[PDB]
Structure formats: C-alpha cells, structure tokens
Design a protein around this ligand. Sequence first.
Ligand code: NAP
Ligand code: MG
Ligand code: MG
Ligand code: MG
Ligand code: MG
Lengths: 498, 498, 498, 498
Amino acid sequence: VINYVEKAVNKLTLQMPYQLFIGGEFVDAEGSKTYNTINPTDGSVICQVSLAQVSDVDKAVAAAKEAFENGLWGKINARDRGRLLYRLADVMEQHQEELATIEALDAGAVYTLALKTHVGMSIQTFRYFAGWCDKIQGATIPINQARPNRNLTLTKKEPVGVCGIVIPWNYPLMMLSWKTAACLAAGNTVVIKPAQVTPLTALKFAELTLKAGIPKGVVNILPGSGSLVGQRLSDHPDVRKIGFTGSTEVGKHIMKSCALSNVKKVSLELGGKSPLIIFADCDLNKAVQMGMSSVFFNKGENCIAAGRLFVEESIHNQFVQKVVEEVEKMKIGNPLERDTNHGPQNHEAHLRKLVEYCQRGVKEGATLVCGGNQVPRPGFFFQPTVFTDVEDHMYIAKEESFGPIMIISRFADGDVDAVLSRANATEFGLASGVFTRDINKALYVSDKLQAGTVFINTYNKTDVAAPFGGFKQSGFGKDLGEAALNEYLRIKTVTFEY
Amino acid sequence: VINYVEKAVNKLTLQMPYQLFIGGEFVDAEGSKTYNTINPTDGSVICQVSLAQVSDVDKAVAAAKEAFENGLWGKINARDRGRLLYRLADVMEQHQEELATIEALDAGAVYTLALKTHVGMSIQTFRYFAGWCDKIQGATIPINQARPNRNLTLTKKEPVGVCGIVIPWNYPLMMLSWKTAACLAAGNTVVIKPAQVTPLTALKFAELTLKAGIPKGVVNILPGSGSLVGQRLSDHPDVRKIGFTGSTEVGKHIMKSCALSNVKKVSLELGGKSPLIIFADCDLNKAVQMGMSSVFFNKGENCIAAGRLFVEESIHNQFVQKVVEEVEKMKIGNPLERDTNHGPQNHEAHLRKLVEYCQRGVKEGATLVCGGNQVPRPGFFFQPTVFTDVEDHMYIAKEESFGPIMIISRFADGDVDAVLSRANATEFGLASGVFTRDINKALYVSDKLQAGTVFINTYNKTDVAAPFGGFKQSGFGKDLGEAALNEYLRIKTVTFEY
Amino acid sequence: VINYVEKAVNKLTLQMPYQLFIGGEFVDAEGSKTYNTINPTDGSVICQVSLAQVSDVDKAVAAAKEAFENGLWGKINARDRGRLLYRLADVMEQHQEELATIEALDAGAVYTLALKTHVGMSIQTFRYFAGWCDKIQGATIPINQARPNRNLTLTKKEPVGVCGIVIPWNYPLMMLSWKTAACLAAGNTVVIKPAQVTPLTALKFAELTLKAGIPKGVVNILPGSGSLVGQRLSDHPDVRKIGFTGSTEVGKHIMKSCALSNVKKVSLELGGKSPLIIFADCDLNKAVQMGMSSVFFNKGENCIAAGRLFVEESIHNQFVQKVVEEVEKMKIGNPLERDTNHGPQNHEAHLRKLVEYCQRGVKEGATLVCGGNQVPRPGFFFQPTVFTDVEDHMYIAKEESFGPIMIISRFADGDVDAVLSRANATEFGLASGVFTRDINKALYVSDKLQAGTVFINTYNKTDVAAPFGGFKQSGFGKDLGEAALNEYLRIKTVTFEY
Amino acid sequence: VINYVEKAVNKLTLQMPYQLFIGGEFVDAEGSKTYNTINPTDGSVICQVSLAQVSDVDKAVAAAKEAFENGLWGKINARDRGRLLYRLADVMEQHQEELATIEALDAGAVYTLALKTHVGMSIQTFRYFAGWCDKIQGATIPINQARPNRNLTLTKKEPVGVCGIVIPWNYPLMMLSWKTAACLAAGNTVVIKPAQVTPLTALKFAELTLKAGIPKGVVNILPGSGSLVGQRLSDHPDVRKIGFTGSTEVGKHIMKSCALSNVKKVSLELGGKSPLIIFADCDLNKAVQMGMSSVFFNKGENCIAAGRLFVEESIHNQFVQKVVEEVEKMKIGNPLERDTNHGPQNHEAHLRKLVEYCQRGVKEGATLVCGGNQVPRPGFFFQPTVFTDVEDHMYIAKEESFGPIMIISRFADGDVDAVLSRANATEFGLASGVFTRDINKALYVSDKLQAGTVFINTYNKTDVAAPFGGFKQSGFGKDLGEAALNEYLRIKTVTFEY
Ligand SMILES: NC(=O)c1ccc[n+]([C@@H]2O[C@H](COP(=O)([O-])OP(=O)(O)OC[C@H]3O[C@@H](n4cnc5c(N)ncnc54)[C@H](OP(=O)(O)O)[C@@H]3O)[C@@H](O)[C@H]2O)c1
Ligand SMILES: [Mg+2]
Ligand SMILES: [Mg+2]
Ligand SMILES: [Mg+2]
Ligand SMILES: [Mg+2]
C-alpha cells in the first residue's frame, strides 16, 4: 500500500504520492525531513513532500546500479524493453486527466494545455522512444585487411549505465518525460531530481512505472534541492551520465562537477534569448497569433519562448496595435477553469523576478505598452506584457525573462543582414523564428540564424521526432528525435582477425 | 620565404620550420621566446622552437575565427573542401620520408614504423575524412502536422566553428591528423597545441597546408605548454569546441575549464589500463606474437596498449617462456637504422617514470622476468620488460605505464566470469582484447568487456574508418570513423508550417 | 453484419469469414463463385470460400486506389498510422488462440507452434513496423552551390501507392504479416492474394483490420487463383508495386508481367536449396537438435529449410545415428494434440510431390535411412525422412523438396574451400548455416557462403528486425527489418535555389 | 600498343580507340565486323568502330566474372578500390579537353558545355563514389535472444558481382560515368554497352582505365546494337544485375529479359514528360532564363528536360514574348566554335523524329510560335522551337520530344490544384519544377508533384550527391547519391547463437 495525499478536484480524485521513490518503493527521506509544495493559483500548501538527503541519493544510485547490472532490465530483449515503455505510455494515457490536474495544481499549468502538451506530449514521447528500442543499430565497417589474414569490424551500441536526470519547473512531467524516455529506451537506469518547487507529477509518474511493470530500481525519484541532491548526483562515482535542463549558470556548475568526479558524460539544455524576426511581407494576422504564442505560451515559462521580436518598420505599429487588442481578450484565472487561457506563474519567487524585470525595462527607457504588474488576485498571476522601443544595449534585450513579456524592436525596411546580426548578437542559441512569405528570405534567414531550432512561419512547433537542443551557451546534446539516443548510448568497436 | 632548421640525415635534407604558425605564416612567439626540443636517441638538442604566449593564442584564435566567419573555407562547397583535404593528403604522401624522419628524430619513432603508421595512417586519415565532406547529411522528419496546415521538418549539419585541439607526444603527427582531419572535414577551423616535447612534425605539417592551398587561418599551430597555451584555448570565449587526447587528470581540468568559460563542447580520449585475456585454446604462437605487439608496439607509447595480460593457468609458463625467447631477439637501436625493432622512449622524464615504475613492481612483489631498466647507451632507451605473478592489488596492476612493460597475471583453467571481473575492475575502459579459438567465448567475452574497443585474436588493429574512444574515466567521444564527425558538427532543426 | 463459418473446436467457437474483402466489406465474388478449402488432418472440406474473378480484382484495386488518394490513410500523421498498426497487433494478440486454431485447421500448423510462430511472429511484425512509421526519414544533402546563389537539396520518403501482395501457403498468416506490415507502415494501401489453398487466416485478419479501425479499402483480400487473381494484380495499370513470395518460376512470370504492364516495382522471395555445413569440431548433440530443426521445422514447409546437410566425415555416422534416434521420438499427429511434434503436410498435391521426390532419390542411388512415404492414417501426413550417400549430381542435391527430408552428404576432414564450393554450386541463394566451435572457420565460411542469410551455430533464427531475402535465383529485396521498408517507399529529391 | 584513329582538331591531336575493350585489351569483334560512327555537324563518317557479336559479349562477361571472382579487384581493400577510382577521375581530368572534343564530334555536344558537364560531371562522379568505398557499412541488430543463450545479428554489404550497363546517346560519357562509378565503387565488375551511335568517349574512357591501373577485366566495353549485345547481356546466366537508362519500351523488354533468364536485378531510368509550373508571383526574368534552360539545354537531349511548361494566365503572354527574344539570340553552329550555344542533334534518325513530332503538333492545332524544322545546313541541326496553345489531350502534351521544343500551356490565375492535376496526368514521373516566390505554394506544389525530382526556382540542377530516378513508368532505382549504391549491393544477414 502506497501513502497518498488525496484531493477531490476537477471532477476526479487525485491520489498523490508525496515520498521519495527508491528501488520500486515510496519511502520517507532520512530523518523524515519534508518541505511544502505551493499551489500558485492561491498560494496554499498542497502537501508536504519528502526532502531527499545525501544518503537517499546514495540509496537511489545503488538501486539503479543493481537494477542495471543484475536486475531484469539489463537482461530482457530490446523489443521487450520497448513493450514495457509502450505499456508505460498507455498507463500515462489512462491517468491523463489526473496527471494534467496535478500539473495544474503544482505548476499553474492551464488544464486544457496540460492535457494536450505537458501530458499529451509526454505520452507521445514514451511511445516514440519505445519504438526505437529494437531499432537502435550498430555497424559493420570495411576496414583494411591484415593480409594474408582477414578482419571483421563491427560496432555495438550499448547503454551508458546509471544516469542522473536533473530538470526545471516549467514543464515538470514533460521535461522529465523527454529525457527519461530516451534514457530508458537506450537500456539505462536512472535517478531523477525534479525541480524542488514542482515534485508532484514526477512522483505520480513513479507510481505509474509500477503499474506498467517497470522493474524495481530502474526509475528512482528524489524530490529535493539541486545544491544537495543534484550536486551529489553530479559527484557520484557510480553515475556515468548526467542529463541536465536548466539555467546556463547551473549547467556550468554541473559540467564542472562531472569533470571533477569521474568524467561522467553530460548533456546541457540551457537558457535562451531566442529571436523572432517578422518581415513586412508575412501574413500579418497570423504573425500576431503566432508571435503572441511565441511569448505567452504556458505563461512564458517556456525555454524556447521568443525573448526578442524584431518587427519590420512598415508593419511595426500595426503589429503592436493588434497584439494589444488580442492581449486585452486574454482570460487570466484559475488553470482548472475551462475559459482560462492565462494561468499563474509557477511560484512566488519567479513572479517577483518578473515584476523586477519589467521595472528595469521601464527604468532603462523601454516603452511599457501594457502589463508589467502582478494581477491583483490570489496566487502568483502576472500580466501579459508588451515592451516596444527596445534597444540592443538594454538589459531586457539581453536577459531571458522566462515570463509572458513581449520585447519588441524595429528594423529598417529591406534590412536582412542587419537584423540577423542583431538577432545573433547573444551568447545564447536555443531557438529562433522568421515570419515571411518570401521563400528566398526564409531559407537565407534560417541558414544565418545561430540557433539550434529555426521556426519558419510558425513557433513552438516541437515534435517528439524532431531533435531539440542549443548552440553556444545554450548548451549541447539533443532531447527528442533519434539524436537524443546518442546521449544515452556508448559505442563499442569490436575488431576480429581470422 | 620560411625559416628552416636544415639537417642532413637518413639520406635526405630535412627542412624543418620551428616557429609558430598563425594565419598562414610562420612567426616568432611574443618576446621571441623559445625552448629546446630534444632528440631521444642521444639526448641532443635538435633545434630551438618558438614558445607560444597567451597573446599568440589570442592571435591564432582570431585568425581561425576570421578564416571561418569571413574567409574562403566557410564559403566553398563541401565537395571542394574535400578536394583540398585530399590534396593535403597527397602533399603529405609526397613528403612522407621527410615526415617519418622528423618523427624519428623528434619522438624516437622507428623510421620503418613511422613510414607505415605515424605518417602512413595520417595520410589515410586525411583521405578518409576528405571523402566525408560531401557525404555529411541531415534529415527530413515526419512530424505531426498542424492540420489544416502542413509542416516540413528538416535538420542541417553545420560546423561548430573555431576548435582547439590538444594532443600528446606518443604519435605526434598521427594524433594531430586523427583529430584535425575530422575537424576540417566538418568545415571547422582550428588551433592546434602539439605536446611541447614533440612540435616538429606538426610544424612541418603546417607548411604542407600551405603547399596544399588550405586557406590562411584555417590551421594554426602553437608549440608551447599545456598550462599556458592549452589552458588559454580551453578558456577562450571564441573557441567553441576542444578536442583533447592525454591523461585523465588533465582531461578533468580541460572539461572543467570548458564548463567555467562558455560551455564549449569537449571530447576526451584519456588513459587506459587495457586487459588482454589469453585462453588456453588460443593459437599459442600467434598469441605470443600479438601479445608482444599489444605491449611493445611503438616502445609501449601507445594509448591502447595492453596494460595487463591475463593468461590461462595451463599455458601461462609456456607463454612466458616463448615471450622471453622472442624478446631476446628484439633489436634495440637508433630509430633510423633499418634493423632496429625497438627505439628509445620519447623523452627523459618518461624514461625516469618507467624506471621508477619497475622499481615499485619489484618492491611490491611481482616477479621481474626480464628488463625493467634503462638500456646502457646514450639517449633514453628502456629494456623490453616482463613481469609475472602480478596480483590485482598491486600498483602495476592498476597504473598505466605507457612503456614497454608486459604485466602478466594467471587465471584458473575454466574461469571465464572471474577473469572478466578482474579485467573490468578498473576505472579505465579504453581498449581490451581476447585470444581464443572458441567462437562462444570470444563473443561472450567481447560483450562483457567494459571497453570502447575489443580486439579478438588480434591487437592494435586500428583503422581510420573504425571509431576509437573510451568508456568510464577513459573519456567520451570518438576519433576515426563516421562517429568522429559528430564531435565537430552541430545539428540545426528547421521547422516550416505552410 | 459479417457472415461466418462457425466451428466449435479447440475449446473455442471459431467465427471464420469466407468471402472476399473489398473496401472494408465482406462480399461474394462475381457470380457467387466458390471453392473448397481442405483440412489436411482428415481431408475434409472446412468450408466454401469466395473465388475472386477479374472484376473483383478491379474492384479491390479501385478501393485501394481511393483509400490511398482520397481516404483518411493518406492524410493522417505517420505517428497516427503507427498507432493504428500497433492497435492492429493488439487486436491480433486478443484473437491469437483463434488465429492459431484457424491456421491448424487450414494449413496443418501444429497449434503450439502456430501460437508462438505463425501468429506470435505476425504480432511482433506489426508492432515492429508500427514503430518505424514516424522514424522513416529522408536527407539533406550538401550539393555544390550555384554561386552567387545558394541551393538546398533534400529528399522526401514517400509511399509507392497501391501495392499487390502475393503469397504462398506454408505460413499463411505470417507471410501475409511480414509483407503487409512493412507495406502499410510505409503508408501504402494493398490488395492481398493469399495462396488459394490457405485463405482462412487472411480473411480472419481482414476482419481484425475492421476491429482495429484501419480505414476502408486500405486492406483488400482476394482468395482465388494465381493465374487469374495474381495475374490481374501484376497486370493492373493502377498497381505500382508487387511483393511476391513463392517459387522461382512463378516469380519469373510475375516479374515479366510487371515489366510488360507499367514497369511496377517488384520484390521476389523465391525458392531455396540452402546448405548447412556441420564441422567435426561442433557441439554434436546441439548440431543434431538444430540440424533436425533446420529440416523438420513446420513439417519442412519452410523456405529457409536446410535442403542439404554437409557433415564432416569423422562425425557423419554418429550424427546420422543420433538423428535416427531423435526422429523415432517425434510424435506425428493431429495439430491440435498438444504433444504433436510433426503435423500433416499442407495439402494433398504437396504430399504426392514428396512421395515422388523420395522415389526419385532412391532410384538415383541415395540411401534412404528412414521415412520416405506417406504415414498410413487419414489426412496428408508424410514421414520425417533421412537420405545419406547423397552426391552432388543428384536431383535431390539440386531440387527443393519443401518437405521434412534431411539430405546428407559427407565432406572430407580438414577441407573448407571444397565443401564451400559444393554448398555454393546452386542457382539458389536464400539461406545457409554452419555449425563449428572454431571462430576462424565460422567467420570465413559466413563470408564465403553465397546466401542472403547465414546462421552460425543455430538455424531458423529469423527476427522481425533482421532482413530476410535471397541472392541469385532466390530473388531480391528484403522482408523484415528496416531494409524491408525500402521496397515500399520511393525517394523524391527536392532541390531549391535561393 | 593500342590502335587509334588519329585526328587533328580543336588544337589537339585526338587519339581514339575504335575496338572492343575486353579483359584489358582492345580487340576486333568476331569476324572483324565494324560499323560507322557519324559526325552530326556535317554527316561525315568519323571512323569505323568494332561491332560486337554474341561471342564477344560472352568473352566480356567471362573476363568480368574472372576479374570479380579471382582477380585483384575482388581481393583489395575497399579503401584501395577507392584510391583506384580517385586515380581514374584524375586521369579523366588530365584528358578533359580531349574527352570533351571527342564528345563534341561523336554526340554534337557544344565543346564548352561538354567540358563543364559531359566531362566535368563525370570526373565529379568518380571522385564522389571513390569516397564511398570504405564508408559502405552494414548493421548490428538487437534481435530477440534465444535464452538462456545469446544471439548476435549483423549484416554485410557485398557486391552483386558481374553487372551489365546499357546506356543512351544523349550524354555518352556522363551516363556511362554515373552508372559505372557507383557499380565499381560497390566492388562489382562490369560490361558496358554504349549506345551504338555514340561509342567513342566510352572507348577512350576504357583506355583511361588502363592508365589508372584498373585491373584487367573489371571494365569491358562493347560498342554494338541493343537488340544483339544489350539483349545477350540481359539474357546472360553469369550477369547478376542490369543497370539501364533509355526509353520506357526498351526498359520493359530489358526487365522481361532479366525475369526470363536468371531473375537478375534491374534498375530502370526511363523517359520523362516533366512539368514546369510557372506562377505569376515568380521572378519573371529568371523564370525565362531557367525556363529556356529547362528545354534547350544540350539541344533538348536531356532526360529531365521540361516537357511541358504551365504558365499562369496573367504572365503567359509576357513570358512567351521574353522567351522568343531569348530564342532569337541563340547561336546555332559547329559545337567546336566558341560562340556556338546550340549544337546539332545527336544523329539523323533523332532529327527525323523531331521533324515528325512538330508536324504532328501543328496538325493537332497547337500554335507554332517559332522553329519546328531542320536548319538548312549540313548535318542534323534543328531550329529551337516554341509551341503555345497546347491542350492536355494533344500528342505533344503527352509524348516526350527529347529535342529543343518548348511546349507551353496556360492555367487560370489562382489555380494550384487544377494545374497540379494536369501536370500529374502522365504515366511518366521523372522530374518537375515550380517557379514562385511564395514559400507556401512552393512547398505544397513540391509535395503534390508526382516526380522523382522537383526543382524549386531552378532547373537542371543535378548533383553527384543528389539521387536521381523516376516514379511510375519513368522506372525505379537511383543514379547518383548514396542511394545509387543500393542498386549495386546485396545485404547478407549473419546470425550467431552463442
Ligand atoms: N531516366 C534517365 O536517367 C534518362 C537519361 C537519359 C535518357 N533517358 C531516356 O532515353 C531515351 C532516349 O534514348 P533512346 O530513345 O535512344 O533509348 P533506347 O532506344 O531505349 O536505347 C537505350 C539503350 O538501350 C539499348 N537497347 C535497345 N534494345 C535493347 C534490347 N533489346 N536489350 C538491351 N538493350 C537494348 C540501346 O541500344 P542501341 O544503341 O542499339 O539503340 C541503347 O544502348 C529518352 O526516353 C530519355 O528520356 C533517360
Ligand atoms: Mg531557478
Ligand atoms: Mg604527461
Ligand atoms: Mg505451388
Ligand atoms: Mg533510341
């Protein structure tokens, strides 16, 4: 029997595990330490959650090591590993409403969005990677022959072993799923550290791995702090790979920690200040819709959000007028209400950061067209915000807000290389976008943009088959697509003489 | 007109550049600083070589950055980049006897071996990778369609940009060539730091890039210290990738330095303590030949050298007797003499380490069968060495010698998993081997060995098409083969809606 | 509602469709023509089955064309096409006992074997290929640039369109499933012609496509004759690809018909006379078990069956003794008896061919060790048979029996190239095997065998991920594995200038 | 010493072999039979060329068989095969002016174009495929394990063996090189049948294989008739693959012949009636230039030539006006004259077809704007032709001219699907094109076009890395790119149990 926090909400009964998940069981942390997880809609405590300690990290890593080396997971056919992962996706689908409701409570995710995206894309992720298991293939290579003898050279793709996954709070289940599905499909075992502020869907997911028959110790989940739990994962001698999504500063520290312990492999999905270039020859009404989505999607808590919009001079004023008209129509409210389309920010400290961010924007001379303030209601709601007259030297032109803040600059009619230079003048390089009907401009701009993803006449169009990752200080390595698997596999070269 | 150190040796007149190579020209280091490079055959000074300073690193990086961003290398077709690399290989082949002679002088490489391997394989590497240029391909991906609209998702493989390559002294030209060929084939530009003790073939290679018509600034070479030049490369804000081969401890420091600066990509080819398991059902005389090669090849200065031989009890004594017979036939001498089998160690400090290494092996109780000492003659020669009765707890069972020291342990007749456990009981995982006529043992053993390469009934059989790289604390990423290209490329995802 | 033949058998009430399946409906053939399908266990008529006419082929092709061009199948996401194929596999699994019972009745497949192989592998096939749908990818290619302009070249993998699949009677559901799964995974629509003698699992499968929600007209099934129905498929102007499995001579005729009509694509999986080479250094008792399986599996009605065993002189007589001992332990009987090892042959004409085949072998001078005739009992049972003293010029050394007839020749101790020559002296090239503990022999022999599949120390080890196809007059193209997809896809090159 | 036809022309002394090339030597045909090859500039006999007989085909195939099975080509490293192919390309480059002059004489190729395309692209082809030799790789596949035992499955890519290549006359050396480069890169040996009317560059190429060190019997060349020499190649029991480029009707017969003999593999590059759709929003002057090229390149003797131009109503009249202006600037003359940009048609019988073609176009009611006739001068020159008011039912809207005949239809402004239907209403599907500045229209039209190549805002942009082949009755299989290799390789699956 598992201990649950039970809650009647959104026409169902939530049964939320709140403990550490280690070696297939829910257990208290060392000293039965706990912390509170906070509902961003009203600021209330949802429940107490176990607070993992160093010795809990060591127990989780040991369980994952044992599951990998001696348990069933390291012994079953790749095809049968695939079947378990497909069954896990099915179990997630069976609990889709519950998962989306937990995400709404824990992260402020608008329920209809959480169903489609946070949860829906997570289900797709597991199904996609389940199909890879028995399709991961090595090679045979026509090497020079040691005549008069013969040689055969092949490669074997093998799992890396025990992995640690450390993730942020913006899409709790979805970030977990992106990384965990690739990690498990490759035959690894894993210890996951969800963001401290958003533990709940990760813990429910953990229970779902039991319903799906994932062998004990294959998945271990440790709610707790990055400075304690995430640090120990990066330091651990039995951990062989870290997959990390989060800020550039923490990413630097993770990579350093991997080096200093045992040169464990690392992948980094870091910040972004992604440019969206909107040309005068675009479909303007569609540009408004997609440009708004590029910023405001999931209350701006979106790693690939456009952190900068460059709008061609001749359409700039009309674009801004139309954005303001649409912003006024947005319904801000409880994420569980079906008419809501703008939920609360994830947690209080982040709301504070956004308020301060917009103060700095105003202070430095940018024009606040709308928003900029907390919404006067319970919880941590922030107004969808538009800045214009943004100049390249400005703080808000350089720093990632991670909030619903549209940051608009003009560029001269007929400029292309000049706007590209400005769009590329960042140490980030996660995503980017261009709206234009001109094929030649679209293709040229996509070539020249220094970003891991370039959207053309769309935005936020991720897909489980399409690799996602940054350039420059946005990191390296891919989540999603075949490419993601390479972070979780090692290649053994075997060379025979006969 | 280039300044050379001219030397008449080996029936040739060598013309050796000795300066820094920056932006297509040989130039003195800042303050005209120099150091001596030492011939290991007699301990003499070959010549003075420029000693690169931090400002020289900055100049090299600036030249590499300009060559990539604005120079011809970044504008030519992939096919034509390929042609230039194939021309470079032809120029290397035209200069092959000279390059091999320089390597004999600088590294103590036996001339006949240097022709075939140090230089021969370097030529193969550039020809192999030249072939990849116009065969590096991205993907088109069947993503979910945003109905009633359509989507197209493709990926583009792009160069990473400015790279730094840092290499060791055991195969100076060959290590340079492995990493440099892959780096340039992927469209990058490069700053290379050869090991301070072995700069000469790198600098002659620099001149050959001019003869081949490689655009100025594409290749820059900086003889000098790792703690100055290599460090600045790892720290530099304009360098986007480091490719490193060397020790595990320096690798840790490089990875840390990559993290703390700009999260530049890193790949690491580190040390090894590679096991070779010899079963009683092997071809014994072949096992003796290949077993000796596994240790003694290139005077043991060989990152994949077998650092432990486990020999089945019933053949152990006969194997050792046969090895001693063959060891006594090895001809030690000047690398330029055609009858030489065993050249001098690379430099004096390494010879000293080898002497100390074998003192400790004797102290801790292993049986010294032969060698263990500096050869009484000028230069830095070391006697091919055989230890037996080696136990798992011993220093020489754990530490990489990087010299011609065969380190033998027994295992009980029939004891497959037990010997595997002992072979895998290391934090290294670079290479490994198994000698057996039994197909079932060979396949099982190669599955169970925790190493990036497994040789079966052979050893030292590398090939430019076969990826080479370690597991665990031997690092990550591959040199050679298609897989090497992935360290030098980035993937851009481009997603259209229409 | 669908009309069924109902049969209370094997603890089940079978519900067997017996009509043509066209455009998602079970329909009578033109003029309500029918034929009898015969139970090989007792020679009884199972039921009457619709006999497709030319006008029925035209209707099926028209339904497939409409389904491809205008129906849902041509519009849904690849991922969602995958979901439907997964669901079809689940539906087949839910009906697995019924399908295996139908196969026992219709083909004489031993029920326990039919569950595991005929049906179980069919389920694996659909699940495997379902995973490929959204992982079928094209390329982006670094072509030469039309300077001062730019070029982008990509490829798109597209379905071929309407396909015809023509199959034999030995594994009715499995052969259908192999080809159909790959065909549908690639986005095509299909008209299937099962062998006239074995229509029933194909028709039950058709019904299962309805339960799975496969759109109308995507799958059409036409029981009837090859010379009428199969011919019209190969001739049809709207069919773009034929996938064929059967005899070399029909294959030739099919390929000719494809040529003369509209040069539709063709793949051919034809006969075999597959050699199994058994060396004296093999594990003898395992060689007997696997050697017997290589011949007797599925009553020898197995395209990859070993049609000759070459057994090394020193073990030949012991091998034959052990085979005879084991043959005598085989239980012959009703496919539904749970201890049956050897079921009846598929139909009466095939039994008669096997009697004649063995008369011919004795006449021409081979030694009949055991078997060679019909088992006296109702139905069409043939004795497991062993021939020795088989010489290379003999009819039975050249002709495929497609029955449970082990055909043994000696080869000389210590010869390898000579036995290889004999094993390769056939115009077939489908499969082959080698039993030896010697790694060098195993690898050399696998290089030298002229056959699409080589088994090493096993036999009949097919796998849905491992491509299966012949060389020489065994045909071309693969079933199973990623390679199977290529027969069902076309490549469009799209080249932009911008 | 080789017998040459010597010719002082184009400031060169041509040395042209004229005999069969068999087993590394130039030899007379059976009975010393010969035929005349005709210069299309003036109708004169260039020289007599050996006329291959059936016994000569058998000698060629025997030489290819021996070279493959026992000669050096079947024994060397893939890497060294690559080196030989690279060397071949270098030799071709050393003879480029001579090859281009021979092609001008034999095929009427304008010298400047023959240098850049006929010859230049052939050189690129051999270099490109030389790079593939040691990069052709098989797989290791994670199959289900026969527990308690283990399984390893790998694939080996092997050569198909002796190949026959049959090619047309429009780009004699280039069509030879496309197919031969891929064939040889895959490790095969070859018998080549050039078009009877254009034997000379093939025979010179044969001599260049000697200069390059290609082993005897690897390349064999048989000038002669399709109905005799080509037929015997397709029939031969020792030929295992035919690569064919030519008409759909000869393709059908070749494929039938492959079927009826030994089911040899076949690829077919057949005719085309390729549509070019020109939208009103295109760059009109560039559309004229590229539209001109699409039709008139290489005097229309171009398999991918646009066979119909569909021009949007609102720009149609202006397009035609601009085309006529450009047509009038074309200089018709001797291909060796530097100012010539329109050479003669290849041979007399082709000229006669073009004359009849345009008579029929006029008869059926199309508007003949200009040309349509043989130019009054010696040789076989044809006036660049423009037809307008072409309706879909007309012969010239359906049938491939293969001459310099622009065939223009209108479509209504704003129609997209309607013009696509018309463009796709053909049994051909080789190439196609769209000109438009609208990204959405370009991507949609490229999806919907039923052709193996789609050009966007360009035409005739082939590349050695970009696969080229037809759909429907334009055949199957690719020349060029990685995909071409698949026609010349077979896959062997090797499955171990251990
Ligand atoms: N898809 C492509 O890549 C491509 C490229 C270029 C051209 N083509 C097509 O080629 C056609 C123009 O050439 P064409 O009309 O001269 O071609 P064709 O009549 O089909 O001849 C092509 C080749 O086939 C040979 N041939 C004739 N009968 C044969 C037989 N029974 N068995 C074996 N070979 C036989 C011919 O020999 P002879 O010398 O005796 O005629 C010639 O060498 C056009 O339709 C064009 O589109 C296609
Ligand atoms: Mg934070
Ligand atoms: Mg050192
Ligand atoms: Mg039959
Ligand atoms: Mg013709």
